[PDB]
């Protein structure tokens, strides 16, 4: 049952209409997670899933076709959004047996709301596909990706008036927290390419990156809106994004930023900065300000145990040919990961470190050498930052149940070391933390790089 004020905004015919509807909803003490997620899913379906008009642009009279191409919007009728809203609420309300004396919900209650979402999904589909994140995908396709399940469970709880069930976010996983002050936890979805019903205590005690040693985000309803905005997927295919969905996500994040709802959301600040890098909004903070905001947010609220705030910043410096600053920010990234244990389900962050060490840094140093042929390659500080990055990775691996470094890592390490002349490398005096890097300190600074020896040393088991 949509309140009358919710009804007046429709029909949404523009991006701003969506923004006004988000603006209107964020003013309430509890914004409608189902209504908001349906609208974004409807908009994204007809902009990215079912692309109505092609995206290509043609090469004294007017041109026969729009010479720059076309953007469009699928009008969201009240009748159509409300019909879908009614389907979900009729589904959820008839499925759970509603005392909750303290405004808190039982573990067995959260479990059957979770079970109602879980058992509504198709048994076979590709969990990693795009555009199955929203309640629109749930109700019209019975398909949800991993964190989409957790979000749907949270939206179902708001539908049943369980103000105490909230979305919990690590950097790669989602679950629910509940109880008098968010102290119980329950897994509600799978992770990886499931532990449903269990707490996350074991994973927090595991010191795996997946559970951030307990320094994860406990969302309020306002950050749960920020999550579904971050979850907007503009990809039409791998080489094509929808300009409309990028613009919508960007204006929505600015709306959330102005209301203060990204203050505890480092990844969302980083997402906004990345959008701002491609499409600056006049009068707004530049991307670097926003990257440093996300880092300050991670330091303030999650005691500096997040990884992505630093790779956001490092990526921006890399794309802008700021070699010193990019190397320093990847060193700081490795400095956070070195206090984690590399565990079974941490493959996402491994993949990102792999790409940095074995693609991004090699490319950055090659770029710098083309200028050389002052410069970063002549700066011992830059070499020290490179070694600090590898030292953190080795410390991360040390004592973990999963190996990190393999022979391919050694190949790129030897290459990156070679980018610094021996006279530069011999100026550093470094204290390493990892046993692996200590066991080749002298081999890293020698005038002649011993590739086989460094390869042997980088690949010794932890
Ligand atoms: C990307 C889709 N998505 C997730 O995957 C997800 C799932 C979870 F259960 C928990 C955190 C999750 O991630 C995020 N949650 N909220 C805001 N934004 C997030 N993401 C940005 C992201 C990390 C940073 N890289 C960029 C680099 C490496 C440059 C810094 C891009 C991908 C992940 C969510 C938005 C639905």
């Amino acid at each position: 049952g949509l309140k009358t004020a919710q009804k007046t905004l429709f029909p949404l015919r523009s991006i701003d209409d969506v923004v006004r509807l988000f603006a209107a909803e964020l003013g309430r003490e509890e914004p409608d997670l189902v209504l908001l997620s349906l609208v974004l899913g409807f908009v994204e379906h007809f902009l990215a899933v079912n692309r109505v008009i092609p995206t290509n642009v043609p090469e004294p009279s007017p041109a026969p076709d729009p010479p720059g191409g076309l953007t469009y919007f699928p009008v969201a009728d009240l009748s159509i959004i409300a019909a879908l809203y009614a389907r979900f609420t009729a589904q959820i309300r008839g499925a759970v047996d509603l005392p909750r004396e303290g405004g808190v919900s039982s573990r067995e209650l959260v479990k059957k709301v979770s079970d109602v979402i879980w058992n509504s999904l198709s048994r076979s589909y590709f969990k990693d596909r795009a555009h199955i994140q929203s309640l629109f995908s749930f109700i019209t396709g019975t398909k949800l990706d991993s964190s989409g399940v957790a979000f749907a469970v949270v939206g179902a709880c708001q539908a049943l008036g369980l103000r105490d069930v909230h979305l919990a976010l690590s950097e790669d996983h989602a679950w629910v927290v509940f109880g008098p002050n968010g102290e119980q936890t329950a897994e509600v979805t799978w992770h990886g390419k499931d532990r449903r019903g269990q707490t996350v205590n074991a994973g927090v005690a595991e010191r795996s990156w997946l559970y951030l040693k307990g320094s994860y985000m406990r969302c309020d309803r306002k950050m749960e809106v920020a999550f579904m905005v971050c979850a907007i997927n503009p990809s039409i295919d791998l080489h094509t994004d929808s300009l409309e969905l990028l613009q919508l996500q960007q204006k929505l994040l600015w709306l959330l930023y102005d209301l203060g709802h990204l203050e505890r959301y480092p990844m969302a600040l980083g997402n906004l900065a990345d959008l701002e890098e491609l499409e600056p909004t006049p009068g707004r903070p530049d991307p670097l300000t926003l990257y440093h905001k996300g880092i300050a947010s991670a330091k303030t609220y999650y005691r500096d145990e997040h990884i992505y705030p630093y790779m956001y910043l490092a990526g921006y410096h890399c794309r802008n040919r700021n070699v010193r600053e990019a190397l320093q920010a990847w060193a700081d990234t490795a400095t956070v990961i070195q206090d984690y244990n590399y565990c079974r389900e941490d493959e996402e962050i491994y993949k990102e470190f792999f790409e940095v060490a074995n693609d991004v840094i090699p490319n950055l140093l090659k770029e710098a050498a083309s200028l050389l042929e002052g410069s970063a390659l002549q700066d011992p500080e830059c070499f020290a930052h490179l070694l600090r990055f590898y030292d953190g990775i080795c410390k991360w691996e040390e004592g973990s149940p999963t190996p990190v470094l393999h022979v391919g890592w050694a190949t790129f390490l030897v290459q990156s070391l070679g980018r610094f002349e021996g006279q530069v490398r011999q100026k550093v005096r470094i204290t390493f933390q990892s046993e692996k890097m200590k066991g080749m300190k002298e081999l890293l600074v020698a005038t002649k790089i011993n590739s086989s020896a460094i390869k042997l040393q980088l690949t010794a088991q932890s």
Side-chain angles (χ1 to χ4, degrees), residues 1-27 30-162 164-180 182-192 194-238 240-462:
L2 269 48
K3 199 63 224 63
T4 286
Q6 309 194 41
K7 238 187 267 169
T8 321
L9 288 300
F10 291 86
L12 326 181
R13 221 161 298 251
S14 68
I15 294 188
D16 283 330
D17 284 324
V18 177
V19 194
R20 319 193 173 281
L21 188 269
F22 270 82
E25 208 67 37
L26 294 164
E30 230 195 310
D32 198 348
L33 259 43
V34 182
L35 159 75
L36 294 177
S37 164
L38 286 164
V39 159
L40 289 191
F42 176 94
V43 161
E44 172 166 327
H45 171 87
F46 288 108
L47 279 165
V49 187
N50 202 71
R51 187 66 185 183
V52 170
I53 316 114
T55 207
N56 262 306
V57 172
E59 167 181 299
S61 287
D65 308 275
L70 257 172
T71 72
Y72 68 94
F73 193 92
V75 47
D77 289 314
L78 176 33
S79 84
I80 292 207
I81 296 302
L84 300 170
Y85 190 97
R87 267 157 72 169
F88 184 76
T89 66
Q91 171 189 162
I92 297 313
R93 246 305 200 170
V96 201
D97 188 83
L98 280 205
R100 270 193 335 111
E101 279 293 272
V104 317
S105 317
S106 173
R107 187 187 193 76
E108 70 143 308
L109 174 54
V110 186
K111 254 189 117 174
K112 302 119 91 193
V113 170
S114 172
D115 282 333
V116 155
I117 304 279
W118 188 254
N119 287 114
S120 287
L121 307 166
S122 316
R123 184 179 67 82
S124 100
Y125 61 97
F126 288 118
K127 316 318 190 253
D128 71 344
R129 74 145 92 160
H131 317 301
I132 53 153
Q133 77 276 62
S134 64
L135 275 72
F136 181 85
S137 168
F138 181 67
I139 315 133
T140 72
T142 66
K143 271 177 304 274
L144 282 177
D145 55 34
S146 170
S147 57
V149 174
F151 182 87
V153 169
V154 171
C157 286
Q158 200 199 22
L160 315 167
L162 322 179
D164 76 303
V165 192
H166 282 106
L167 175 70
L169 294 206
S170 77
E171 286 189 308
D172 196 50
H173 191 39
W175 56 97
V176 306
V177 283
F178 54 103
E183 57 261 75
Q184 287 70 308
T185 69
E187 299 269 13
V188 309
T189 194
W190 71 90
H191 184 250
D194 78 81
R195 305 209 334 300
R196 271 171 86 263
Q198 316 177 17
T199 72
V200 305
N201 303 3
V204 172
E206 205 164 53
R207 287 166 27 90
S208 69
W209 169 71
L210 198 59
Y211 295 93
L212 301 171
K213 307 178 222 156
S215 306
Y216 50 97
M217 305 159 60
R218 291 97 155 151
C219 288
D220 51 51
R221 298 273 173 241
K222 310 294 199 313
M223 313 169 50
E224 281 154 2
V225 181
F227 175 80
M228 48 177 282
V229 181
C230 291
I232 298 170
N233 196 340
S235 317
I236 300 189
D237 66 14
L238 281 90
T240 324
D241 285 334
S242 148
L243 308 154
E244 309 88 343
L245 288 166
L246 287 159
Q247 255 312 297
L248 168 66
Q249 189 179 52
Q250 171 164 53
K251 309 223 262 153
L252 279 177
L253 281 164
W254 273 126
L255 175 77
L256 288 153
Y257 178 94
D258 290 338
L259 281 280
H261 300 313
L262 304 184
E263 167 73 36
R264 299 173 92 112
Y265 206 148
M267 275 192 291
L269 293 157
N271 301 152
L272 186 50
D274 281 356
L275 291 173
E276 275 308 306
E277 192 196 335
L278 288 301
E279 310 292 14
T281 313
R284 288 295 189 179
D286 44 18
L288 262 166
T289 315
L290 291 163
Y291 293 124
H292 292 296
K293 268 230 172 73
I295 289 172
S297 173
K299 285 172 188 294
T300 304
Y301 300 106
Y302 311 99
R303 62 217 259 199
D304 208 14
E305 283 167 323
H306 290 191
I307 308 286
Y308 286 139
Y310 300 97
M311 318 168 135
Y312 273 116
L313 174 65
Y316 180 81
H317 281 314
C318 154
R319 294 189 288 281
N320 290 128
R321 291 193 83 161
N322 298 335
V323 184
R324 270 137 182 131
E325 289 94 342
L327 286 178
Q328 174 174 228
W330 283 317
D332 305 332
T333 312
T335 289
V336 178
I337 199 61
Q338 79 178 6
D339 286 348
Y340 278 94
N341 296 345
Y342 185 42
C343 284
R344 284 169 173 241
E345 295 161 299
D346 291 343
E347 255 161 14
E348 196 53 23
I349 204 57
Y350 176 86
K351 175 239 217 193
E352 293 296 349
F353 277 114
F354 183 101
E355 268 176 53
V356 168
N358 308 332
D359 193 44
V360 186
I361 291 180
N363 280 355
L364 181 67
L365 302 179
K366 190 172 55 163
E367 190 56 308
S370 84
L371 284 184
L372 208 76
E373 87 190 314
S375 155
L377 304 186
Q378 312 189 120
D379 191 351
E381 199 197 314
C382 287
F383 183 64
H385 285 319
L386 182 62
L387 300 188
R388 179 143 75 251
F389 170 82
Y390 276 93
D391 191 49
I393 303 277
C394 291
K395 192 71 180 13
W396 180 32
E397 173 186 69
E398 217 167 275
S400 304
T402 317
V404 170
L405 292 143
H406 305 258
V407 69
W409 292 71
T411 293
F412 291 101
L413 165 64
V414 169
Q415 176 186 98
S416 295
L417 294 172
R419 284 322 185 155
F420 299 84
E421 277 191 86
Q423 96 156 351
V424 175
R425 298 187 277 112
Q426 270 135 45
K427 272 131 154 204
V428 295
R429 315 278 186 261
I430 295 315
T431 287
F432 286 130
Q433 303 234 36
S434 78
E435 229 157 53
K436 190 168 272 187
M437 291 288 290
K438 301 154 117 73
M440 46 185 179
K441 184 147 86 125
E442 275 323 299
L443 218 61
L444 301 165
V445 304
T447 300
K448 184 71 28 183
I449 291 150
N450 189 340
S451 148
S452 92
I454 293 159
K455 185 146 68 204
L456 249 194
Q457 176 69 8
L458 203 68
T459 52
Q461 324 99 357
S462 64

